[PDB]
Amino acid sequence: LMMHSQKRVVVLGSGVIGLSSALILARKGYSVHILARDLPEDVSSQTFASPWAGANWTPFMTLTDGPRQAKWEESTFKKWVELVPTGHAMWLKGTRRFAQNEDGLLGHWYKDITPNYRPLPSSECPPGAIGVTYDTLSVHAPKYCQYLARELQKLGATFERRTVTSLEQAFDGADLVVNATGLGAKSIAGIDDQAAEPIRGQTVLVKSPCKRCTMDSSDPASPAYIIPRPGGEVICGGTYGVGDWDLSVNPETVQRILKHCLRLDPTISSDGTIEGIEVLRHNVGLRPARRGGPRVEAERIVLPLDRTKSPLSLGRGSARAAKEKEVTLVHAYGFSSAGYQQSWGAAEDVAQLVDEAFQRYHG
Amino acid sequence: LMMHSQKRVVVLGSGVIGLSSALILARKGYSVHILARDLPEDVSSQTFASPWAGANWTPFMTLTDGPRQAKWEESTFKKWVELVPTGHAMWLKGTRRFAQNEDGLLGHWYKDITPNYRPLPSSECPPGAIGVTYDTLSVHAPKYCQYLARELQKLGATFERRTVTSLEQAFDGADLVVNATGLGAKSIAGIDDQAAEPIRGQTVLVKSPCKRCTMDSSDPASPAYIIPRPGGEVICGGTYGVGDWDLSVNPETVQRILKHCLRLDPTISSDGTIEGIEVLRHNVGLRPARRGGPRVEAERIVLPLDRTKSPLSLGRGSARAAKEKEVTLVHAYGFSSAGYQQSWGAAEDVAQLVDEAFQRYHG
Numbered sequence: 238l239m240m241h242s243q244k245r246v247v248v249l250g251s252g253v254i255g256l257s258s259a260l261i262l263a264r265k266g267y268s269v270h271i272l273a274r275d276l277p278e279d280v281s282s283q284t285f286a287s288p289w290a291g292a293n294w295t296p297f298m299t300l301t302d303g304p305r306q307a308k309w310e311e312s313t314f315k316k317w318v319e320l321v322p323t324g325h326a327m328w329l330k331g332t333r334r335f336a337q338n339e340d341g342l343l344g345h346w347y348k349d350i351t352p353n354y355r356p357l358p359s360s361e362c363p364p365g366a367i368g369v370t371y372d373t374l375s376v377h378a379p380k381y382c383q384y385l386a387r388e389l390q391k392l393g394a395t396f397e398r399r400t401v402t403s404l405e406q407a408f409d410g411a412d413l414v415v416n417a418t419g420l421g422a423k424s425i426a427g428i429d430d431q432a433a434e435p436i437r438g439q440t441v442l443v444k445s446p447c448k449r450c451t452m453d454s455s456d457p458a459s460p461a462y463i464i465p466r467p468g469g470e471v472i473c474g475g476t477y478g479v480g481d482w483d484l485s486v487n488p489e490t491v492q493r494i495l496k497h498c499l500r501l502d503p504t505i506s507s508d509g510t511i512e513g514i515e516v517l518r519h520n521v522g523l524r525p526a527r528r529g530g531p532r533v534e535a536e537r538i539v540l541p542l543d544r545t546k547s548p549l550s551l552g553r554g555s556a557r558a559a560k561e562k563e564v565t566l567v568h569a570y571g572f573s574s575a576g577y578q579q580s581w582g583a584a585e586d587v588a589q590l591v592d593e594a595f596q597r598y599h600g
Numbered sequence: 601l602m603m604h605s606q607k608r609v610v611v612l613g614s615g616v617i618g619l620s621s622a623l624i625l626a627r628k629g630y631s632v633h634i635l636a637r638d639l640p641e642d643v644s645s646q647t648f649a650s651p652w653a654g655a656n657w658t659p660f661m662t663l664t665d666g667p668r669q670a671k672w673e674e675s676t677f678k679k680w681v682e683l684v685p686t687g688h689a690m691w692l693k694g695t696r697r698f699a700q701n702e703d704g705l706l707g708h709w710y711k712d713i714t715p716n717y718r719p720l721p722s723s724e725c726p727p728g729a730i731g732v733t734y735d736t737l738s739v740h741a742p743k744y745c746q747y748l749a750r751e752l753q754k755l756g757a758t759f760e761r762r763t764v765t766s767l768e769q770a771f772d773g774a775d776l777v778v779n780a781t782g783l784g785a786k787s788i789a790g791i792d793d794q795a796a797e798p799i800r801g802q803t804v805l806v807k808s809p810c811k812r813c814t815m816d817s818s819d820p821a822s823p824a825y826i827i828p829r830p831g832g833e834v835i836c837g838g839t840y841g842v843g844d845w846d847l848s849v850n851p852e853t854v855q856r857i858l859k860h861c862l863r864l865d866p867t868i869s870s871d872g873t874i875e876g877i878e879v880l881r882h883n884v885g886l887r888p889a890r891r892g893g894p895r896v897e898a899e900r901i902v903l904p905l906d907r908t909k910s911p912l913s914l915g916r917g918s919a920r921a922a923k924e925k926e927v928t929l930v931h932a933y934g935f936s937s938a939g940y941q942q943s944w945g946a947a948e949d950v951a952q953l954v955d956e957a958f959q960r961y962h963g
């Protein structure tokens with residue numbers, strides 16, 4: 238006859254978004270169980286995006302285009318600042334950002350967040366490009382996720398490897414589920430989001446003491462970036478293949494990335510030559526994006542599903558009846574190229590949604 | 601001071617081809633270690649093709665177009681016949697095969713292998729299509745792989761989960777490696793096969809006592825097949841998306857597959873209606889194909905790799921020196937839509953190549 242928790246929540250997905258959401262909920266005293274196919278220890282799995290990130294803080298939208306994104310990025314920057322003393326985040330001082338034009342600098346909205354923000358002289362920019370410099374932050378993407386999982390462990394959250402094909406499979410043991418499935422949201426019956434799309438990103442992981450970050454979007458024919466991460470390594474990018482699911486390494490892309498990154502910063506090489514670059518690994522990850530932007534909202538759903546709710550519902554197309562329950566589904570997916578830099582703010586919004594739903598529907 | 605084996609081989613890949621190759625080699629007394637990312641217990645992993653097969657025996661080429669394929673298929677049919685008494689293979693009696701024309705029947709080359717081979721009357725074919733009927737065989741693809749793994753266990757083979765990015769990582773503990781990596785062959789340094797390509801196959805797994813197999817290639821706008829497998833289930837297909845990496849479920853494709861399969865055989869439904877079909881799961885697998893056909897051959901390779909051998913070689917582009925060794929690489933990949941039905945014959949050819957290489961290079 239023990240007093241049992243009335244705050245059970247299932248988090249579906251264990252990428253940086255499911256982990257961050259799960260952690261703030263655990264901190265709020267929720268009993269959290271994480272169901273996912275890919276776990277933080279799967280550091281080379283291509284069926285989720287989180288092991289492949291830079292991961293740095295680089296706003297990609299204006300305030301008007303992405304009000305939520307900016308909110309989430311500002312909050313996450315504050316969190317990452319707090320992680321520098323223990324090494325879970327690292328300063329990228331004198332980061333260099335190049336754009337094709339003034340508009341590509343996004344209204345400079347974040348100039349109060351990144352220290353020492355200032356324009357760069359044309360002499361310090363690629364020919365014909367415009368640029369700014371600032372201090373931003375980066376995390377070691379797989380290790381950051383493992384860090385969050387450790388924090389979750391201490392708060393009593395649990396993990397389970399599972400691959401869901403229909404919503405009722407996630408509503409096992411909880412009347413509220415956080416859906417942080419990335420690309421998976423499209424093929425789970427009861428979610429069926431056709432708007433989910435991948436954005437392919439190929440990179441080269443390099444061994445280098447280079448501590449300078451350079452983000453170059455001034456050449457529309459060649460996206461390029463150099464992101465140092467904790468550990469004496471730098472990630473050289475990159476690609477943005479919208480709707481591209483190809484998980485194979487493109488050898489031509491390798492050449493373009495290294496050549497371009499070498500232009501940007503020869504110190505990524507031992508001798509300033511492409512042949513002098515110490516390659517550690519060739520990577521391809523699929524960013525989980527979504528037409529219409531990231532989805533962060535709570536939905537009320539009736540179980541069991543019927544073929545009317547989902548074309549992918551299981552069992553016979555003709556269905557009703559017994560049993561029948563209403564549950565809460567809190568979406569958190571489609572962060573595209575900004576899942577890490579938005580993760581803490583997004584998790585905050587998710588946790589507020591869960592609190593609200595609990596008040597309105599779960600007692 | 602024990603007498604140690606001089607027949608150590610590494611098998612890279614644990615799909616039906618790596619497993620079959622490994623088993624015949626183990627039977628020949630080789631000491632076999634299987635290195636792979638995906639193992640037979642990973643029955644819903646989309647990063648290899650073997651969990652998603654029908655898997656039945658359906659020749660796809662003429663003798664002239666695919667002499668190896670036919671050889672491999674004929675040998676595998678014999679093996680599967682031997683597995684019927686213990687249930688690891690099942691007869692698909694009165695299988696129905698529809699084609700657009702006489703040429704689509706491939707010269708009837710296999711009519712001596714499949715019992716009761718005979719043409720079908722136009723009345724028993726889709727309008728305007730031509731057809732034949734015969735008894736063929738099917739295996740339960742993931743359970744068949746688990747069966748092979750059990751056989752391997754008894755013969756002393758071992759398994760290890762590993763994801764290789766460069767050949768020297770596979771030549772650990774053996775001077776000969778069998779490369780059965782499917783699509784992976786394209787991105788492993790030292791193999792770098794740009795010809796490897798996926799062929800996307802979406803299917804619907806259905807609960808049904810239907811024991812009749814129907815293969816319909818008469819409608820070029822709608823590939824369709826119904827493959828019963830051991831266990832009271834049938835796999836309804838399908839798609840052949842050449843070069844398509846999309847792992848998401850296409851809801852429209854679902855409708856087309858079920859409608860077409862229902863035309864072909866209403867008993868896949870409880871009431872002969874689409875709504876009467878008991879859906880178990882929606883699946884998407886990537887067939888590992890290869891332009892130029894499957895690759896089954898032995899290659900002599902010098903380690904360590906240099907950037908001249910592979911654009912993806914690790915370390916600095918400028919490389920030589922110490923150490924330096926020659927090893928044997930036996931390729932076995934690119935079986936496309938016929939990996940199961942060709943697996944035993946292919947494994948036979950692989951094992952002969954290994955025997956030959958051992959004679960010529962490993963003592």
Ligand SMILES: Cc1cc2nc3c(=O)[nH]c(=O)nc-3n(C[C@H](O)[C@H](O)[C@H](O)COP(=O)(O)OP(=O)(O)OC[C@H]3O[C@@H](n4cnc5c(N)ncnc54)[C@H](O)[C@@H]3O)c2cc1C
Pocket residue numbers: 249250251252253254255272273274275276284285286287288289290291292293294295399400401402417418419420421422425437438439440464474475521522523524525569570571572573574575576577578579
């Ligand atoms: C090359 C590259 C560079 C990047 N660099 C940056 C960067 O510097 N800064 C930044 O902010 N972002 C960066 N990103 C983007 C960031 O990787 C992604 O936004 C973020 O990882 C998305 O996290 P997620 O949790 O939403 O999804 P994912 O990490 O994809 O996790 C989805 C989770 O859901 C699980 N799941 C999916 N379907 C199912 C199912 N059916 N049942 C059970 N579980 C399921 C998966 O297994 C996994 O646990 C980069 C990404 C790449 C590819």
Ligand SMILES: Cc1cc2nc3c(=O)[nH]c(=O)nc-3n(C[C@H](O)[C@H](O)[C@H](O)COP(=O)(O)OP(=O)(O)OC[C@H]3O[C@@H](n4cnc5c(N)ncnc54)[C@H](O)[C@@H]3O)c2cc1C
Pocket residue numbers: 612613614615616617618635636637638639647648649650651652653654655656657658762763764765780781782783784785788800801802803827837838884885886887888932933934935936937938939940941942
């Ligand atoms: C829908 C569908 C229907 C089919 N039906 C039939 C059928 O009825 N009859 C038939 O004969 N065939 C059928 N097939 C085709 C059959 O699935 C494939 O030909 C067969 O599975 C190929 O086996 P494989 O061993 O070559 O490759 P895979 O099964 O893809 O295994 C490749 C292995 O290599 C590992 N690997 C890859 N890269 C690396 C790396 N870098 N390091 C470590 N390991 C690595 C993988 O993890 C895995 O272990 C179908 C396939 C599908 C998708």
Ligand SMILES: N[C@@H](C(=O)O)C(F)(F)F
Pocket residue numbers: 291293295438462474475524573574575
């Ligand atoms: N966010 C990273 C991306 O996903 O590639 C970028 F900073 F490099 F842009």
Ligand SMILES: N[C@@H](C(=O)O)C(F)(F)F
Pocket residue numbers: 654656658801825837838887936937938
């Ligand atoms: N071999 C199967 C395929 O890969 O889809 C088929 F028989 F259905 F064709």
